[PDB]
Design an enzyme around this catalytic site. Structure first.
Site, PDB file in Angstrom:
ATOM      1  N   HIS B  41      55.242  10.006 102.960  1.00  0.00           N
ATOM      2  CA  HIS B  41      55.730   9.271 101.798  1.00  0.00           C
ATOM      3  C   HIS B  41      57.230   9.017 101.857  1.00  0.00           C
ATOM      4  O   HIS B  41      57.745   8.248 101.037  1.00  0.00           O
ATOM      5  CB  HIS B  41      55.373  10.032 100.517  1.00  0.00           C
ATOM      6  CG  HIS B  41      55.456   9.207  99.272  1.00  0.00           C
ATOM      7  ND1 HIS B  41      56.655   8.856  98.688  1.00  0.00           N
ATOM      8  CD2 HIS B  41      54.486   8.678  98.488  1.00  0.00           C
ATOM      9  CE1 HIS B  41      56.419   8.140  97.603  1.00  0.00           C
ATOM     10  NE2 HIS B  41      55.112   8.017  97.459  1.00  0.00           N
ATOM     11  N   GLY B 143      63.427  16.574  96.038  1.00  0.00           N
ATOM     12  CA  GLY B 143      63.936  16.830  97.368  1.00  0.00           C
ATOM     13  C   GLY B 143      63.297  17.990  98.102  1.00  0.00           C
ATOM     14  O   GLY B 143      63.715  18.290  99.228  1.00  0.00           O
ATOM     15  N   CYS B 145      60.118  18.226  99.152  1.00  0.00           N
ATOM     16  CA  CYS B 145      58.999  17.896 100.021  1.00  0.00           C
ATOM     17  C   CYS B 145      59.367  18.141 101.476  1.00  0.00           C
ATOM     18  O   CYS B 145      60.518  17.978 101.889  1.00  0.00           O
ATOM     19  CB  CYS B 145      58.567  16.447  99.815  1.00  0.00           C
ATOM     20  SG  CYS B 145      57.770  16.204  98.226  1.00  0.00           S
TER      21      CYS B 145
HETATM   22  C1  LIG Z   1      59.127  15.674  97.172  1.00  0.00           C
HETATM   23  N1  LIG Z   1      60.374  15.805  97.460  1.00  0.00           N
HETATM   24  C2  LIG Z   1      58.621  15.644  95.742  1.00  0.00           C
HETATM   25  C3  LIG Z   1      58.498  17.060  95.179  1.00  0.00           C
HETATM   26  C4  LIG Z   1      58.219  17.061  93.676  1.00  0.00           C
HETATM   27  C5  LIG Z   1      59.390  16.674  92.786  1.00  0.00           C
HETATM   28  C6  LIG Z   1      59.074  17.364  91.470  1.00  0.00           C
HETATM   29  N2  LIG Z   1      58.352  18.551  91.915  1.00  0.00           N
HETATM   30  C7  LIG Z   1      57.824  18.419  93.128  1.00  0.00           C
HETATM   31  O1  LIG Z   1      57.107  19.253  93.708  1.00  0.00           O
HETATM   32  N3  LIG Z   1      57.355  14.936  95.657  1.00  0.00           N
HETATM   33  C8  LIG Z   1      57.265  13.712  95.129  1.00  0.00           C
HETATM   34  O2  LIG Z   1      58.228  13.108  94.665  1.00  0.00           O
HETATM   35  C9  LIG Z   1      55.878  13.074  95.143  1.00  0.00           C
HETATM   36  C10 LIG Z   1      55.858  11.881  96.102  1.00  0.00           C
HETATM   37  C11 LIG Z   1      56.305  12.270  97.487  1.00  0.00           C
HETATM   38  C12 LIG Z   1      57.605  12.043  97.907  1.00  0.00           C
HETATM   39  C13 LIG Z   1      58.015  12.415  99.178  1.00  0.00           C
HETATM   40  C14 LIG Z   1      57.132  13.026 100.036  1.00  0.00           C
HETATM   41  C15 LIG Z   1      55.843  13.269  99.631  1.00  0.00           C
HETATM   42  C16 LIG Z   1      55.430  12.891  98.363  1.00  0.00           C
HETATM   43  N4  LIG Z   1      55.451  12.682  93.812  1.00  0.00           N
HETATM   44  C17 LIG Z   1      55.101  13.610  92.907  1.00  0.00           C
HETATM   45  O3  LIG Z   1      54.975  14.803  93.181  1.00  0.00           O
HETATM   46  C18 LIG Z   1      54.832  13.105  91.488  1.00  0.00           C
HETATM   47  N5  LIG Z   1      53.510  13.480  91.015  1.00  0.00           N
HETATM   48  C19 LIG Z   1      52.584  12.536  90.776  1.00  0.00           C
HETATM   49  O4  LIG Z   1      52.774  11.350  90.925  1.00  0.00           O
HETATM   50  O5  LIG Z   1      51.440  13.116  90.368  1.00  0.00           O
HETATM   51  C20 LIG Z   1      50.196  12.348  90.145  1.00  0.00           C
HETATM   52  C21 LIG Z   1      49.801  11.689  91.448  1.00  0.00           C
HETATM   53  C22 LIG Z   1      50.438  11.327  89.053  1.00  0.00           C
HETATM   54  C23 LIG Z   1      49.163  13.366  89.716  1.00  0.00           C
HETATM   55  C24 LIG Z   1      55.959  13.499  90.484  1.00  0.00           C
HETATM   56  C25 LIG Z   1      56.012  15.016  90.283  1.00  0.00           C
HETATM   57  C26 LIG Z   1      57.315  13.024  91.011  1.00  0.00           C
HETATM   58  C27 LIG Z   1      55.698  12.836  89.129  1.00  0.00           C
END
Ligand SMILES: *C(=N)[C@H](C[C@@H]1CCNC1=O)NC(=O)[C@H](Cc1ccccc1)NC(=O)[C@@H](NC(=O)OC(C)(C)C)C(C)(C)C
Ligand SMILES: *C(=N)[C@H](C[C@@H]1CCNC1=O)NC(=O)[C@H](Cc1ccccc1)NC(=O)[C@@H](NC(=O)OC(C)(C)C)C(C)(C)C
EC number: 3.4.19.12
Lengths: 304, 304
Positions: B41, B143, B145
C-alpha cells in the site's frame, strides 16, 4: 491506536551483557567501557550469606578469582572494587558496543524496561514499575542476578536497576547502578518481605487519559470532585492519596484531551465505588497503574 | 519466580529496520540480505485506496520512485516486485546485520513479539497473540506499517507478521512475510471489522500451570471433570472448546506439575462458574490467555 505495556528496544543493552563467575556462582554483569558491574553477592558461597562480611570476603579474593565471559571470549580482570552492594571489575578491554549512558535512581511509581539475562545472554524483555513498596513485579530465576532495568532517551541508556533478590511473595528487589538498594532491602538472609502494594493513583489517571485518547470515553461524567473528596475514596480501595504534584504532572494530558484532572478524578472515583460493569477500558477489565504520564505521551504520540 | 508478559530481545530485528518512502507515503521496511520488504500500500496516494489496482499502480512506478533509508544512508533500489500484499525492493547493498532467519505463518493462539517502528527506527517492543478472529491487540500509529512480529529460536529469527492496518475497534491486521493476510482482511477500503474475540482456552490452562509452578495452588480441587462437561461450561463465558490436540500439548506441563489436564479443566470450570473471589492468580484478578504452553516452559525453565 491501541495501548499495550511496551518496553524499550533492548538492542543497546544486549551488547552490554556479560557472564561473571566467582567460585561456583555464575551470574550476569553489565560491561560499560572497561568496567563490569555485578552484584557483590557473587563472592559468597552457599554458606557465606548467613552472616556475610563482604569486606573480609572481598579482601580474600584476587583478580584471577573473577572470570568474565563476553560471548565466547574471556575478558581479563585487572582490578576489582566494591561500591555499596555492587562489585566493579576492571577489565583490559573496553566494550566496543558501549552506548551513551547514565546511571539514574528512579522514584516509586516510575517505570523501566527489564532485560532478563542468563549466562550473560539476553532472554527476554518486559516493562516494570517501581512499586510504592520499593519492589518490582519481575520474572527472574536462578542465575538472573545482574540483569538490569533501564530507560532510553534518544541514544542515551539510563540504567536504573540491577537485580539481586526475590522476596517470598514472588516479587523482586535490587539496587541502582551505584549499588544502593531500593527500599529497606539488603543482600543478607533476614526476614524481609514486600509490604502492602498500594495502587499508583497518578498512573491510573494517566492510563484513563490514554483511554480517552484512544476513543474510550464512556466512563467520563460532567460532575467534578475535589481533591479532598477524591482522596477520601482513594484511601479505601488502597489507592495512593493524590497530591498537588501528581495533579501537576497530569497537566499535559489534561490539556491534550480537554478533560480536567479533577473531572478524571470524579470518573475514577465513580469507577472505584460502583466497580466496572464487567466492562473494559482499553480492552482491560481492570485499572492499570504501570504507565506514567510520560509513558502515555510517548506511546500515543512521541514514538512517531 | 514471577510471571510476566515477556517479549524476545529485539536487537537482532532492530538491525533489519529501514525507512521506505514512495511519493508522500513513508513507512517501515524489513531489510534482509539485499531485499527490503514492506506493505504494498506504500505505492498508493491518499485517494488510490478507494479502488486500488495494485498491478497498474506498480507498473506505473520505476526503481527511482522508491527511496530506502538505513539510518543516515540512502540505499539504491535496483529492482522491485510484488508478492501478494508485500512489496519486495531489491537494493545494491546486502544488510551486514542480516540474522539467520525464517519466514513462518503462525496459527491462531500462537504468540510473537512486535517491534513497533517509526521512520525506520525501533520505538518499542511488546508481546502479542494471534487472536482466534485473526487480529492482534497491537499499539500502532501513523507510519507504523511495516513493523514486524517475530519469534527467536537460538540465533534464528522467525518472522511471522508485518503490520498493515487498524480495524475500527483499535485492533490490528497484517500479513505474513509472504504477503498473505491473516484472516479475511485485505488492504482495501471495505467494511472490515474484527469478529467476536474468543478466549484461547489452551492458553488459559497453560497460564494456570504457570501459576502452579509459581506456588499458586489455591484454585486446585480434587475432583476431575470430563472434556465434554468442561466444554459445556466453556461455550458459555466465550471460551474455545478444548480439543484433544489442545489436551495433548498441555501434556508436558501436566507431567511437570503432577496436575492432570482434566483436573486443571475442573479447576478452570470452577473459576468460570463461581468467579474469582476478587482473588489473584499470579497477581492478576483475571485469567490470561496470551501465553502458549511453550511460552510457559520457556519463561519458567528454558530461559536459564
Ligand atoms: C500504516 N502506516 C498504517 C498504520 C495505522 C495508522 C493508524 N493505526 C494503524 O495501525 N496503516 C494504514 O494507514 C492503512 C493503509 C496502509 C498504509 C500503508 C501500508 C499498509 C496499509 N489504513 C488503515 O489502517 C485504516 N483502516 C481502515 O481503512 O480500516 C477499514 C478498512 C475501513 C476497516 C485507518 C486506520 C487509517 C483508518
Ligand atoms: C540471582 N541470581 C538470584 C535471583 C533469584 C533466584 C530466584 N529468583 C530470583 O530472583 N538471587 C539470589 O540467589 C539471592 C542472593 C544473591 C545471589 C547473587 C547475587 C545477588 C544476590 N537470594 C535470593 O533471592 C533468595 N531470597 C531470600 O533469601 O529472601 C529473603 C532474604 C529470605 C527474604 C532466594 C530467592 C534464593 C530464596
Amino acid at each position: 491506536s491501541g495501548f499495550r505495556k511496551m518496553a524499550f528496544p533492548s538492542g543497546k543493552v544486549e551488547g552490554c551483557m556479560v557472564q561473571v563467575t566467582c567460585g561456583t556462582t555464575t551470574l550476569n554483569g553489565l560491561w560499560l567501557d572497561d568496567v563490569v558491574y555485578c552484584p557483590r553477592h557473587v563472592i559468597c558461597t552457599s554458606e557465606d550469606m548467613l552472616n556475610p562480611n563482604y569486606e573480609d570476603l572481598l579482601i580474600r579474593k584476587s583478580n584471577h578469582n573473577f572470570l568474565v565471559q563476553a560471548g565466547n571470549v574471556q575478558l581479563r580482570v585487572i582490578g576489582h572494587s566494591m561500591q555499596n552492594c555492587v562489585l566493579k571489575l576492571k577489565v583490559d578491554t573496553a566494550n566496543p558496543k558501549t552506548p551513551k549512558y547514565k546511571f539514574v535512581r528512579i522514584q516509586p511509581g516510575q517505570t523501566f524496561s527489564v532485560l532478563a539475562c542468563y549466562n550473560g545472554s539476553p532472554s527476554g524483555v518486559y516493562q516494570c514499575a517501581m512499586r510504592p513498596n520499593f519492589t518490582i513485579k519481575g520474572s527472574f530465576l536462578n542465575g538472573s542476578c545482574g540483569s538490569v532495568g533501564f530507560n532510553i532517551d534518544y541514544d542515551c541508556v539510563s540504567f536504573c536497576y540491577m537485580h539481586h533478590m526475590e522476596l517470598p511473595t514472588g516479587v523482586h528487589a535490587g539496587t541502582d547502578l551505584e549499588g544502593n538498594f531500593y527500599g529497606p532491602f539488603v543482600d543478607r538472609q533476614t526476614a524481609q518481605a514486600a509490604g502492602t502494594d498500594t495502587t499508583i493513583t497518578v498512573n491510573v489517571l494517566a492510563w484513563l487519559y490514554a483511554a480517552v485518547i484512544n476513543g474510550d470515553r464512556w466512563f467520563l461524567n460532567r460532575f467534578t470532585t475535589t481533591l479532598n473528596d477524591f482522596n477520601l475514596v482513594a484511601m479505601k480501595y488502597n489507592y495512593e492519596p493524590l497530591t498537588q504534584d501528581h495533579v501537576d504532572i497530569l497537566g499535559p494530558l489534561s490539556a491534550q484531551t480537554g478533560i480536567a484532572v479533577l473531572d478524571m478524578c470524579a470518573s475514577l472515583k465513580e469507577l472505584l465505588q460502583n466497580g466496572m460493569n464487567g466492562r473494559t477500558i482499553l480492552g482491560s477489565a481492570l485499572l492499570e497503574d504501570e504507565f506514567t504520564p510520560f509513558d502515555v505521551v510517548r506511546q500515543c504520540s512521541g514514538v512517531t
